[PDB]
Structures are given as structure tokens and as C-alpha cells.
């Protein structure tokens, strides 16, 4: 059990947590409750040992992306802040603590990477990775390099693959809007009794398998979906449907088929206080958290008229797509043409732009204080941008959960809301430790007069949310042999994103 009437605080050895502390004593103070803040060791491993058997602290700090498998075991609690107070946060930092479309944690904090220069041999970075090869040519003369970092681990080079289309898992912004204009669509369409067959032809717009509970599309029905979709702006004029391009609006079709065809209210799901709720079993466990798969929960959600909760489609990977090819094709070629090598990892290329040997790194903010240490005088900038489009890195969101079965839920979200998620509040931890780009906007356009947390919230808002889904540890696998696969000749570019994609997917 979690002592009541008070509160218990664990952040990892590596953060603010004296601050963390005085941000506490300005709370233990005013209303009388001692916050103890412990770091204890390992405490991402701990923590989900001890919440599940109903013991660990009141409060968690850590990324974001930790705590979508903590949420897996409903060991955190869906905290409740109003619609004004999350209008005080960056918007996509409430991207990073949604799991099965509820918010279950408070965003502190964002970090991604940036492109690190040196000043005095590249007073002007470049703004394109196209021009990186001229630069590089420029400055072997010189007896420098124009680019060196970590080419083993493709958490660094997937920003540049990413660029021109690459994506992990698709988590469309329109997805809540694709869903209800698509929904539209339904009422126009004629269920038959079967597919078309060489013994059989029907007059509607597709059938049901009612065994497999799927829907096929007729031919007469996949003419008029794309003239229904077509018409209200969703699909240009002359697309299909089952081309590679429209794989979203084609999830979105057969979804909304289902939801309609084959999923009943008070019998398969309820709708329950603005919520799609399934009745698992007949007449025996009937609701939970748990959520069907394939879009058809959302599907059933704008069928309902129901807010719309985004998630991530993981059966949509675009690693073997032709933004992806072409972005690491460039990588590729950067090795070939001698430019970088593709033995260089994480220690080779912080001692080279630390001894002055390259002009230009790319890393986050936990590499700045060995720079410093360094004296090159660096600077912070936004990532090239590849093909015109922003190079695109994954963000890492510093959260802080509240445990399940903590019975100082309100006192927790008392001293989150109000007392850390404050100007005052997070100064006083990033002082102690500095926190980087952090979520409040308030508090933010304050450090973003260094130009170098500028840099990082800038990239951040360019990338993309580092996905908190179990599928996430497949795909870095993968691509870490694609990418290593395709540096060293190996394979090429597209055999080696081929076999990725299909790992991913099988």
C-alpha cells in the first residue's frame, strides 16, 4: 500500500531532483504534505515490479515512451486535466502521453536531435543535405571532414530517411477527421448477399462474410466509394483505392464497412459516457480498456458519433516506400563518394567533432556538456533538410505518470498541475539540472533564448513523436540491419528496406 496524506516522487539519478525537491517544499509548506523524492537505481525496471502489486511511488518521472508499456499493465492512472490547462502545453507533447487514446501522463520536458556545427571552421551550416558532398570536398582539402555521427544505430540516420517519407507507424493528424467523412459514405451503400461470382451477380456495393466478419467491396461498389470519396475531397480525381498511395483511405473504408456491417450496439460494444466500450464475452466480462484492432474501434467510434481516439496503425510501415529509399540512398552514396564512413559509430564521431576534426555532428543535449568541455565553440541548428523537407527525429517526451494505486491521486495532480507545470516550477528543476526544450509554452519561450534549446524544440516540432507501442523495439531492430546492410554493401538500398518492411510486418 502507498502511504496516504503525502506524496512520493521517483526521477531518474540524471535529472534536477534537489529542484525537484524545492519545487516540493514550496508544496510541503503551503499545505502541510512532505513530499519525499527519491532516484533509486534502475527505477524504469522497478517501477513496474512494485505498481503491480499496488506498492512504487505516487508519481513516475521518465520518457515518455516508457510509459505506454507501463499503461499496458494499467499501472498508471488517466489523469484528468482540464481543456484549458492542457492548452498551456505544446500540443503534440499530449501526443506522447496518450495510450489506447487516454492520457496518462503530465509532459515536462522535449528533447530530439539538432545538427551540432563547429563555428570556426562553418560559420554558415548548411541548410540541405544535398550540399553536404560539395562542403565535405572543401574542407578534405583543408585537412578537415564536413560531417561525422553515429551511422551504427539508425535512431541517428533516421531522420534523414524520414525527410522525403519515411515513417515508423502511421499516426495520421486528419485520422479523426478521415473517419467521420468517410463515415458519410456508409449510407449510400447496398449490402448484397454475396460476392460476384461466375454463377451469381448482385445489384449492391459489397457483401459480408459473416463467419470471418469482413466485408468484401463489389466491383459496382469500389466504382462508387471512389466517386463518393472523390467528390468530398478525400481522394484525387483519378486514384484507386487499392493503389499503395491511398493504404489509409483504404483502412478507413473497410473499417467503417465493419463497423456498420458487423458490430451492433448493446451487443458486441455499449456506448457508455461518450466512450465505445466492447462487451467482450456474452452475458460474462463486459467492459475494460482493451480495444479492437485494424481501425474498426475508431470506425465504431465516428459511427457513434463518439470522440475519436487516435492511435497508431500498425499495419501501415513506410520503411521500404520511396521517401525512405531516397533517403537513405543519399546516406548510402555519402559513403561511397568517401564523404563518411560507414564504420563510424557514436565514440568515433563525438571525439572527431570534440578534437575538431569534422565541422559538423549530429546529437542531442545529452552530448553538449563533453563539447563544452571540448572549448570548440559549437553551435545548435536545425537539421538539414533533404529534397526540400525537413530532416525528421524522433521525440523524446520527459513525463510524469501518477501510479494506479495511488490514493493521493488529486494531492499528485495537485502538485503536477499547478506547482511543477509552472514558469516557477520548472525553473526551479532546470536550474538544478536543465531540462532542455520543455512542454509549457510559457516557460519555454524563456529558454528558447538560447539558441541552442531553440534548436531542439524546433527539430522536435519538425520530428515526430517517438512511438510508445510495443511494435516500436521490431522496427529499430530492423532498420538497424537495413541501414547497416545497405552502408556496407551488403545489399542495396531497396533489398535491404524490402526486408525490413517484411520483418516488421510478417
Known sequence: KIEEGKLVIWINGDKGY??????????????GIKVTVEHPDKLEEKFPQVAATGDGPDIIFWAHDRFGGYAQSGLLAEITPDKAFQDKLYPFTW???????????????????????????????????????????????????????????????????????????????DSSEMYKRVNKIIPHLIRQEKE?????????????????????????????????????????????????????????????????????????????????????????????????????HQAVEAKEGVQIQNEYDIKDVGVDNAGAKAGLTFLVDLIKNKHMNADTDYSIAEAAFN???????????????????????????????????????????????????????????????????????????????????????????????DPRIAATMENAQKGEIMPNIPQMSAFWYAVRTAVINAASGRQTVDEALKDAQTRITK
Open 355 to 449: 578534437k575538431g576534426e569534422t565541422a559538423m555532428t549530429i546529437n542531442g543535449p545529452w552530448a553538449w556538456s563533453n563539447i563544452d568541455t571540448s572549448k570548440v565553440n559549437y553551435g545548435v541548428t536545425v537539421l538539414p533538410t533533404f529534397k526540400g523537407q525537413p530532416s525528421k527525429p524522433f521525440v523524446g517526451v520527459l513525463s510524469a505518470g501518477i501510479n494506479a494505486a495511488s490514493p493521493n491521486k488529486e494531492l499528485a495532480k495537485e502538485f503536477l498541475e499547478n506547482y511543477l507545470l509552472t514558469d516557477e516550477g520548472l525553473e526551479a528543476v532546470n536550474k538544478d539540472k536543465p531540462l532542455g526544450a520543455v512542454a509549457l509554452k510559457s516557460y519555454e519561450e524563456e529558454l528558447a533564448k
Open 196 to 296: 460476384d461470382s461466375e454463377t451469381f451477380q448482385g445489384e449492391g456495393h459489397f457483401s459480408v462474410d459473416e463467419k470471418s466478419r469482413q466485408v468484401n467491396l463489389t466491383e459496382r461498389g469500389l466504382v462508387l466509394i471512389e466517386e463518393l470519396l472523390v467528390k468530398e475531397g478525400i481522394m484525387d480525381e483519378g486514384e484507386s483505392l487499392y493503389s499503395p498511395a491511398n493504404i489509409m483511405l483504404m483502412h478507413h473504408v473497410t473499417a467503417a464497412l465493419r463497423a456498420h456491417a458487423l458490430f451492433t450496439r448493446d451487443v458486441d460494444y455499449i456506448v457508455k459516457d461518450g466512450e465505445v466500450i466492447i462487451v467482450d464475452e456474452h452475458t460474462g466480462r463486459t467492459m475494460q480498456g482493451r480495444r479492437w484492432s485494424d481501425g474498426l
Open 95 to 173: 501526443d506522447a502521453v496518450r495510450y489506447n487514446g487516454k492520457l496518462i501522463a503530465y509532459p515536462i520536458a522535449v528533447e530530439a536531435l539538432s545538427l551540432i556545427y563547429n563555428k570556426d571552421l562553418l560559420p554558415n551550416p548548411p541548410k540541405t543535405w544535398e550540399e553536404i558532398p560539395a562542403l565535405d570536398k572543401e574542407l578534405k582539402a583543408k585537412g578537415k571532414s564536413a560531417l561525422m555521427f553515429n551511422l551504427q544505430e539508425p535512431y541517428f540516420t533516421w531522420p534523414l530517411i524520414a525527410a522525403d517519407g519515411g515513417y515508423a507507424f502511421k499516426y495520421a493528424e
Open 18 to 31: 534537489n529542484g525537484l525537491a524545492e519545487v516540493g517544499k514550496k508544496f510541503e509548506k503551503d499545505t
